[PDB]
Amino acid sequence: PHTYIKTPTYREPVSDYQVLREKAASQRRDVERALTRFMAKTGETQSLFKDD
Amino acid sequence: ALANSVTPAVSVNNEVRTLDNLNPDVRLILEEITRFLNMEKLLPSYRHTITVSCLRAIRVLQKNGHVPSDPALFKSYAEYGHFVDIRIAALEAVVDYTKVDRSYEELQWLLNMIQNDPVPYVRHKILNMLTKNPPFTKNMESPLCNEALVDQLWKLMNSGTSHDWRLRCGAVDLYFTLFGLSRPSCLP
Numbered sequence: 001p002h003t004y005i006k007t008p009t010y011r012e013p014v015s016d017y018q019v020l021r022e023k024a025a026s027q028r029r030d031v032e033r034a035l036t037r038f039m040a041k042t043g044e045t046q047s048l049f050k051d052d
Numbered sequence: 053a054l055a056n057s058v059t060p061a062v063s064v065n066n067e068v069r070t071l072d073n074l075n076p077d078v079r080l081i082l083e084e085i086t087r088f089l090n091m092e093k094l095l096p097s098y099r100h101t102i103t104v105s106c107l108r109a110i111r112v113l114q115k116n117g118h119v120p121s122d123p124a125l126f127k128s129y130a131e132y133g134h135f136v137d138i139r140i141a142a143l144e145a146v147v148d149y150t151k152v153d154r155s156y157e158e159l160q161w162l163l164n165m166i167q168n169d170p171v172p173y174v175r176h177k178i179l180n181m182l183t184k185n186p187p188f189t190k191n192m193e194s195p196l197c198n199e200a201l202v203d204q205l206w207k208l209m210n211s212g213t214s215h216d217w218r219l220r221c222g223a224v225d226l227y228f229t230l231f232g233l234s235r236p237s238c239l240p
Contacts, residue, residue: 036090046128048082048110048119049071 054081055109061117069120078118085109088197104141111145115152123149123158132170140177147181154195159187163204172216179222183229190232197238202231 014020074082089106097103103209109131113119126149129142143162150158162178169175186192205227213219231237 003195032091033087036087036094039094040090046125048086052071052119 054084055105055112057081058112058116058118063117064119068069069117075118081109082113082119100135100138103135103138104147107138107141107145115148121149121153126222127161129164136171136174139171139174140181142177143174143178144181146187147178147185147187149177151185151187154187156196159201163208166208166219167212172219176222179226180217183222183225186226186229188230190230190237197236199239202236202239205230 058078058081061069061078063069067073085106088102092100093101094108107126110119110125114121123146126142126145129138130146132137133141143165146158146162149155150162162182166175166178169178187196205223209220209223209227211225
């Protein structure tokens, strides 16, 4: 085959609903955590604990 | 549902509730309600339903020995410029705090807020919540049964609530709940 063979195949896509739900959930949780920590650090802040 | 799962913590020798000796269960709950309340500060709900639920859950965590029993958060949410549902949830938390911690200055804060608040519905609701969850009943011996408190509540029935007809009946209900139909006992 190597002498004269070519396989123009595509790329296996991800159809796993479980891992797609997990990826979208974790990315949304991480971006909202990053956003709220950035907005609490660059403004007036409160704390449930002393000096937290 | 997160607030319903909170069981009372196992404090040893009245250990101060700090961040390191937190329950491993309650740290996840506290992270979630912190995330929800902070996200409500940026993307608000319909009637701040998540603010009301998170304030209620912080009061649940404070009622058990998890978060320090400090009313300053609820006292900041009970200011005038907030939505009225946030205000009545925060004032419910302050009424529960001054019932459990027998706070004198928080009861004076609530009575001052009854006397001079702009919204009269909030004044009626504070008298209503302080009747439903009273700081003491007539049977209890409490540190808050002075002649000063009897004179304040009699002045609130007599004068002070003379302009509403609903604050005066609420003050009569509060005096009945606290001191009963006879002469206040804790008096000369």
